[PDB]
Symmetry: D3
């Protein structure tokens, strides 16, 4: 049949943007309850009734989640400019080799904002 699954995670982190003007709130040390949705697309298995067990997606994500959660994002190599966009890219890059069916990463910095990457 071919569908799209998703699983959402929340990590509690600090970050700050290095390249904004002096008076900019985004350049001050702050943090968020980030949410990340992991999307995968694939053919639904006839016998298991699913594309992939949600729990395998949780297990694959865990070490990446643990780097991010309760940490300062600017200290991870590659995230010295931890915009929502760069965080999407980085999460995509970490996951993609471990999860070929990855179709989309969505990060929500706040409750009223979102960014989405599809490897394009």
């Amino acid at each position: 049949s071919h569908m799209e699954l998703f699983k959402e995670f929340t990590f509690e982190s600090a970050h700050r943007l290095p390249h904004v003007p002096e008076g900019h709130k985004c350049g001050r040390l702050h943090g968020h309850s980030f949410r990340v949705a992991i999307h995968i697309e694939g053919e639904v298995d006839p016998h298991t009734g699913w594309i992939r067990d949600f729990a395998e997606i949780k297990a694959i994500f865990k070490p990446i989640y643990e780097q991010l959660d309760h940490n300062y994002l600017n200290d991870i190599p590659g995230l010295e400019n931890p915009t929502s966009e760069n965080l999407c890219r980085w999460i995509w890059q970490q996951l993609k080799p471990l999860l070929p069916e990855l179709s989309k990463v969505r990060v929500h910095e706040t409750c009223t904002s979102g960014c989405e990457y599809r490897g394009d």
Copy 2:
């Protein structure tokens, strides 16, 4: 003439059980969820009514399917003997397509942090 997508959301409080998972797997025990399903349509907006079709008609069309689902054990429903999220999506789409030809997407959320989306593909 403008083309747009609409959606309408429903919750149903159901029990289910997965028959093919390993013997200690938690999904294999009798359990339940507050399932959410969003029903999406696409079409052109009418210049007079100013809409594609009333949200209430989408509700009205889904009601019979929804009543099978809500406050019930999903495994007892013909066609849902393996009521995974994926299987629930295709099933609702099979049920709804003939009634609602502009149907473009069915979305099911087993929990607040997961979900399945089906476009009839």
Copy 3:
């Protein structure tokens, strides 16, 4: 540059009434909603700045439009004589697109379970 999609969501508290619904239909009465609107932009992420567009500029551009809608009677706004979600989506698009070229989607929710989405098409 890698292509991505960003959204900012706003909420306005407004009254409205639908002029062209049948006699007896609830939407023909004066009522209102906590309307949510999400503004979506698409584009190439700049390698240096790490963004497509400063959200804060988006917030600033949208402000006077937001201020027309919030704590106001939608029907009194020119072009919103029939303030359906559909016509809200399109009205908002028409006001914003000249000022925000990367605008790719306007999404309006009149209720917590209903939704409309316009891409300009």
Copy 4:
């Protein structure tokens, strides 16, 4: 014979305005909201039924008041000419206590970030 407090929550989509606020206040303009109202009751838990009252008896009893409120202009309802959240809370209590003796609290939310609570005192 345990003492507990139960609640049920309803949402009504309504318009209102405050008559008595200074000239250019935003609350003095015709606007509206998706109002959330929670009805709380207190009592002893019945050993036979395992509950204080059926969630759906409360719903059945509230339906007449809810329907006055929903998809309407609140200023036209007698006793709500000044439909602040406070006066709304009082009015709902006045309408409901006669018909639900175990009523303990009325909670009204104009928006997702505000709330008013009345305990009959």
Copy 5:
């Protein structure tokens, strides 16, 4: 030590049915919910730790009780032969109180618009 109230929330995905409702009533059908439980404690804030008790401790304490409830059929649990929100509040309390003396409230939500709240005998 300033006196305060903390709470920790948990979601368990469970099946149940109510054995004592009239023959047609939906609650007597086998179904389920995403039950939310909130565990509250009260006490004095330590001048050094700056807290009453680490949130994670409340979670660690609840874990054996949570694991009985989650992904299970509640009716099969002893004490829960009538698993209403009320009985499930009293039951959670009875299990929790010996382990967490500062326990002050158990709050159970069968759905997103309903709730039950208990404070012991």
Copy 6:
């Protein structure tokens, strides 16, 4: 005529706990989307139909909110141990003299936890 009102705000902040044991996740630099509800109690005025104009509560709370939001909490005087409990107490100290109907301060560090203070 006696009621309780609240108004809720979200501050996006960094913090770390200095007094947690050596391996504890909270001793690392991190952050949260903190939600604070500010409750007042009082008599509804028969003319205005309110206890207090929400616009005035918001104007009074605003610059205190501006200190918390998009900032490192440990740099605020009095917030050297910025737990949720200490957050509540700090907010109550700052606000109570300027809002005497203040009845309750409530902060939620995450979507699943919360702390409630009523000046006791």
